[PDB]
From a paper:
Interestingly, [name], the β-lactamase from [name], possesses Ile at this position, sparking the question about the evolutionary preference for this amino acid. Mutation of Ile105 to Arg in the β-lactamase [name] simultaneously enhances activity for carbenicillin and the ability to evade clavulanic acid inhibition.
The crystal structure of [name] [name] in complex with clavulanic acid revealed the trans-enamine adduct of the inhibitor bound to Ser70 (+155 Da), which is formed after decarboxylation and initial ring opening of the clavulanate. In this complex, residues 105, 130, and 166 are slightly shifted in the [name] enzyme compared to the resting state form. Interestingly, considerably shorter soaking of the wild-type crystal (10 min) was previously found to yield the propionaldehyde ester adduct bound to Ser70 (+70 Da). Although the structural investigation did not indicate any significant repositioning of the active site residues besides 105, we speculate that the larger active site in [name] [name] causes faster dissociation of the Michaelis complex, thus slowing the initial ring opening of the clavulanate and formation of the acylated species. This is in line with the crystallographic observation that the short soaking of [name] protein crystals with clavulanate (∼10 min) did not yield detectable density for the adduct. The data for wild-type and [name] [name] could be simulated with values for k2 and k3 that are very similar between wild type and mutant. However, we needed a Ki for [name] that is approximately five times higher than for wild-type, implying that the reduced sensitivity of this variant likely originates from diminished affinity for clavulanic acid, rather than enhanced hydrolysis.
Numbering used by the authors: 28 to 57, 59 to 83, 86 to 145, 145A, 145B, 145C, 145D, 146 to 238, ...
């Protein structure tokens, strides 16, 4: 069955794989280690942007945030281009989603909850969406590096899927703010080889990736069939047996997505 097929992916990639797709009117839920904890890595940046959108008027997107070169302690290809002069909230949202910029996400955390309270406030946003499981405890780059088995900085496939479902398909956000989030996800530069690679080209896909130590590679997505029927897909993985420097395997996620697409076709 589907569980056997997912188990074979795990054997071949020497990995742990988590998959969740919510039920619809006509399709059963797809669940594989869906309630096991996996590190968010950069997947948290999608609800983070949602939180910042939700709590502020649209004009807040043009609020200028200044920061220094020494605020960059993580891979930040956009934020480095604009040090000292700063970046608007909107620019930070774009960078955090489309490039997975680390400093951009930290600055958004500070905008949401202040310098000390950002990770709690982010977690609290998830709580407001009924997610009582996920937790963000550290910011970039530490959130990508927690040991296997540690609950800190983790979500579950099930939990993050339900969050993304409310954000993109539900009414957690007003239409205008929702459209900004979905648009940034649609124009991301990091996700072509993950869930997108498992769905035929006539399906629409928007996603947010994450990558971390211990071979961590995640992708969360909303997809629409050629006739507009939506599904939410969360795929999470690690290769912790290889140690902190284990290589991530994007193709594992593409394969998991292909399995899902096959069932939903
Ligand atoms: C989001 O996932 C942002 C950064 N992740 C850290 C990274 O890619 C390094 C993995 O070794
Ligand atoms: Zn079997
Ligand atoms: Zn569950
Ligand atoms: Zn603000």
């Amino acid at each position: 069955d589907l569980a056997d097929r997912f188990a074979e992916l795990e054997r071949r990639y020497d990995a742990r794989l988590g998959v969740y797709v919510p039920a619809t009117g006509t399709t059963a839920a797809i669940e594989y280690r869906a309630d096991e904890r996996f590190a968010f890595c950069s997947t948290f940046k999608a609800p983070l942007v949602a939180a910042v959108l939700h709590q502020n008027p649209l004009t807040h997107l043009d609020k200028l945030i200044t920061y220094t070169s020494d605020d960059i302690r993580s891979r930040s290809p956009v934020a480095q281009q604009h040090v000292q002069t700063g970046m608007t909230i909107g620019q930070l949202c774009d960078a955090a989603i489309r490039y997975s910029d680390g400093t951009a996400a930290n600055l958004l955390l500070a905008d949401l909850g202040g310098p000390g309270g950002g990770t709690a406030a982010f977690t609290g946003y998830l709580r407001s969406l009924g997610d009582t499981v996920s937790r963000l405890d550290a910011e970039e780059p530490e959130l990508n590096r927690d040991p296997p088995g540690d609950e800190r900085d983790t979500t579950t496939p099930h939990a993050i899927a339900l969050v993304l479902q409310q954000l993109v398909l539900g009414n957690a956000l007003p239409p205008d703010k929702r459209a900004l989030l979905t648009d940034w996800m649609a124009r991301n530069t990091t996700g072509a080889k993950r869930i997108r690679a498992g769905f035929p080209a006539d399906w629409k896909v928007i996603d947010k990736t994450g990558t971390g130590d211990y071979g961590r590679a995640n992708d969360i997505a909303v997809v629409w069939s050629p006739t507009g029927v939506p599904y939410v897909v969360a795929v999470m993985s690690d290769r912790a047996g290889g140690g902190y420097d284990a290589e991530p395997r994007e193709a594992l996620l593409a394969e998991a997505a292909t399995c899902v697409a096959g069932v939903l076709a």
